[PDB]
Paper text:
Non-specific phospholipase C (NPC) hydrolyzes major membrane phospholipids to release diacylglycerol (DAG), a potent lipid-derived messenger regulating cell functions. In contrast, NPC harbors promiscuous activities, hydrolyzing major membrane phospholipids, such as glycosyl inositol phosphoryl ceramide (GIPC), phosphatidylcholine (PC), phosphatidylethanolamine (PE), and phosphatidylserine (PS). NPC4 is divided into a phosphoesterase domain (PD) and a C-terminal domain (CTD), and is structurally distinct from other characterized phospholipases. Mechanistically, CTD contributes NPC4 activity mainly via CTDα1-PD interaction, which ultimately stabilizes the catalytic pocket in PD.
Numbering used by the authors:
A (entry chain A), B (entry chain B): 12 to 258, 264 to 415
The structure:
């Protein structure tokens, strides 16, 4: 089994249908969207009783940040708002009908951004990566909540009860065991390449003296370690600082495309390219539309810890589908992975799939929680007998 | 008393003589340096004989970062290194003779940068601020240690035992009472205007919900509140993110001049200009040379907490002199404040002077610590009967 280096890049706040849904005309196998059988959500307002908003392919490069709190996402997936005076934590029916309404509730006119996705040619970096490697069109954010609970799952398969971006809790640090500790204890290496203060600092255990040395400034160390073949066994690329103090500004998809291109090309020209498995995913969907109902059946709480009031979240429902890419010369081009042949009938691909698959590939002894123990593993995406030799050396520049 | 808004900007890593020492030619009253009676430090090395390095005015805009740990500063001020096998915490004799030796010890050739200051004309923003307002030439960093223990003093008059930049300790947060809490309890407002993640988040008490709302993005909110005269009673401008993971890279003094210019002009064109007292100081001296012996007599420990081993620091010695500016239309131009007039015979101006003076100007009930209660207060710098009306509207662009 050729994979010795696993590289993880977690992007920000985009749904599958918004990012890749229109890539379906390039490959019908992609569970995306079409113009002929279009998806839609309705909007109610004081001025109008009902307006149908069709999911289109007119996403602009610059967009506001839609709502992605646990309470926003409740309205998006169930089509009705949370009501603390009439609490309905498990209403049963994720029909994905509330994205446009939740957008409008948060900011008038924002349903246009929420109800649009990108044309493939507007994201050439992604179009090339989809066509030359693999994606998963059934990969759900771990939590129907915001950025940090999901990021906590990426490297620990739990959020240790968190469903918000609680500045005090994040700074105090979350104490659960991380995949870094599993790897280290088994003698494997790991490195976190950061630009700004990384969200991985929110793991309290990584603040031990012996683990703080595994953080490396990205600009200094990343391209260098790629060039001389010195990448550790588990590489995390951390790019943005999370504004802990941000108690719906616009921003550009282009920066993320540039980062993906740079990271890919550095891995692609590395002597370790033939041992590398590169995963790109999104922390959560950002409030953008997606048509696939979030799983509500057979989803385990990772550690028995409930979320804070008023939601008292049971972690018995997944988040919304996000774009996930698998990139390796050992992968056939244009491959699309759906649900797992996961260990259980109701297993799903989600962020805990990353620690699960790391545990599987490196034969670590134990899973971290009940979530990585249950999540699908994607090591079977590595299918070739020999590494492909003509993988693109460079990708197109973002528009 | 005309002062209703106090604004604080803390710059990084520069000594008084390095920044303002050559202004003595412009104002003989300044305790600076001359060419005819020059300061010097000696260097001992293996290959070469003892070499005198004279303090010159040849500072370049780009310099390395000299040593400014508690152990480096011990050698700088006492002229001998710390010795854990022969510990000498209170050697008696701050002769300021070790800056060049300590520089060479950290990086060969670095004594040249450490033993140089700026020509006044090389820093036009500062030269204009000095000539149009006030400086203090006897203001000491609170701690002969690194960045964060000193920044803790600026808004709390203690470091709660800290003598290093301990990432785990900083993220856990320091729990001492802050001047923000003194102000809030007395009905006054405060605002922290930050660009990147602010060091004030290291105060644990500011992570409460009711205080997190007082943080404002600088780019969004600062110039705005300056225009509409909506500045709170205590303004902190936070500009740089401290890399907690940095376990001697070069950087440019020009960025700090640009920031100072931007902040000054925004306060100067504000309707609140006639009620504003703006203080600029430096967290500590960065390891650059200064000739004034650090006070070792009558310096109180703020709260009885000792520093960590091996130094077990008693907080009975001040840090090195830093540049400090007082800026307000109620200030006589070209004013230089020396040591304080009380509250005690051995009182000194230092970072705790900021909380002390805030307590004095706003008649807050209690000081925060024994340092606060002992430090000099500079309210007497406000001397005019009417606000000056021809304060510079704009400043020179940095070279």
């Amino acid at each position: 089994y050729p994979i010795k280096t696993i590289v993880v890049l977690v992007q920000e706040n985009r749904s599958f249908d918004h990012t890749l849904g229109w890539f379906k005309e390039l490959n019908r196998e992609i569970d995306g969207v079409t113009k002929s059988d279009p998806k839609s959500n309705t909007v109610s307002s004081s001025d109008t009783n009902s307006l149908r908003v069709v999911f289109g392919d007119q996403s602009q490069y610059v967009n506001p940040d839609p709502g992605h709190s646990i309470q926003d996402i409740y309205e998006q997936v169930f089509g009705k708002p949370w009501d603390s005076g009439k609490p309905d934590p498990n209403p049963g029916h994720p029909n994905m009908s509330g994205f446009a309404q939740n957008a409008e509730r948060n900011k008038k006119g924002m349903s246009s951004a929420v109800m649009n996705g990108f044309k493939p040619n507007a994201l050439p970096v992604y179009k090339e990566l989809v066509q030359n490697f693999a994606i998963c069109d059934r990969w759900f954010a771990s939590v129907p909540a915001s950025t940090q609970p999901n990021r906590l799952y990426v490297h620990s398969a739990t959020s240790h009860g968190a469903t918000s971006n609680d500045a005090a809790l994040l700074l105090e640090g979350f104490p659960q065991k991380t995949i870094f500790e599993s790897l280290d204890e088994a003698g494997f290496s790991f490195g976190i390449y950061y630009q700004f203060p990384p969200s991985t600092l929110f793991y309290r255990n990584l603040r031990k003296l012996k683990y703080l040395t595994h953080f490396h400034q990205y600009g200094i160390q990343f391209k260098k370690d790629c060039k001389e073949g010195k990448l550790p066994n588990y590489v995390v690329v951390e790019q943005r600082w999370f504004d802990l103090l941000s108690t719906h500004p616009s921003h550009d998809v282009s920066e993320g495309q540039k980062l993906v291109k740079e990271v890919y090309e550095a891995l692609r020209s590395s002597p370790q390219w033939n041992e590398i498995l590169f995963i790109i995913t999104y922390d959560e969907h950002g409030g953008f539309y997606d048509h696939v109902p979030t799983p509500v059946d057979g989803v385990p709480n990772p550690d028995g810890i409930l979320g804070p009031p008023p939601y008292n979240f049971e972690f018995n429902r997944l988040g919304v589908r996000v774009p996930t890419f698998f990139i390796s010369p050992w992968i056939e081009p244009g491959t699309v992975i759906h649900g797992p042949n996961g260990p259980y009938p109701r297993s799903q691909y989600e962020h805990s799939s990353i620690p699960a698959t790391v545990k599987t590939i490196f034969k670590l002894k134990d899973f971290l929680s009940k979530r990585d123990s249950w999540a699908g593993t994607f090591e079977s995406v590595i299918t070739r007998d020999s590494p492909r030799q003509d993988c693109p050396e460079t990708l197109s520049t973002p528009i």
